[PDB]
Amino acid sequence: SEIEIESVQDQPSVAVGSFFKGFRAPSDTTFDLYKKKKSEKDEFVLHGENERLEYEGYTDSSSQASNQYVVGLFNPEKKSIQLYKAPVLVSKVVSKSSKNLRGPKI
């Protein structure tokens, strides 16, 4: 009893993102993908904006370099997986209120 692998896709397409417990975002929120083609591997960066906040996520390069994440979609009935390499991105969300500051001194 072992599951067979049907297909593997090796180039950027799907991504995975860590967020606060409760992230839901607008029905239309958009996620900008980036690709910093750095030497051997391309460290990725995600960036989005909404009406109040803007969310930016990135990979933990020193842990990214030592472990790599893969996501696949399996069908029980076709015994087939469409494999996708996906970056896991630890994303933080800043708001418009998070962009105000005081004087440079007292």
């Binding site: 417990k21 209120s97 001194k105």
Partner: protein, 57 residues
């Protein structure tokens, strides 16, 4: 921070409640520290007299 502390441990009423006292209590004391930058300004501003870094920072 909550997920950082309790995580999957959502069942510790002991910890859920102490942590509600901590986070809600901080929200009580400093309602105007709304983002990290303001907080940093409060720490630098409140210790600038003692870190000997003056107008130089």
């Amino acid at each position: 921070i909550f997920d950082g502390i309790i995580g999957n441990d959502v069942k510790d009423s002991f910890l859920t409640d102490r942590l509600e006292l901590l986070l809600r209590g901080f929200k009580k004391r400093y309602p105007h520290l709304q983002n990290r930058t303001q907080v940093l300004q409060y720490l630098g501003d409140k210790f600038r007299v003692v870190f000997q870094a003056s107008p130089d920072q």
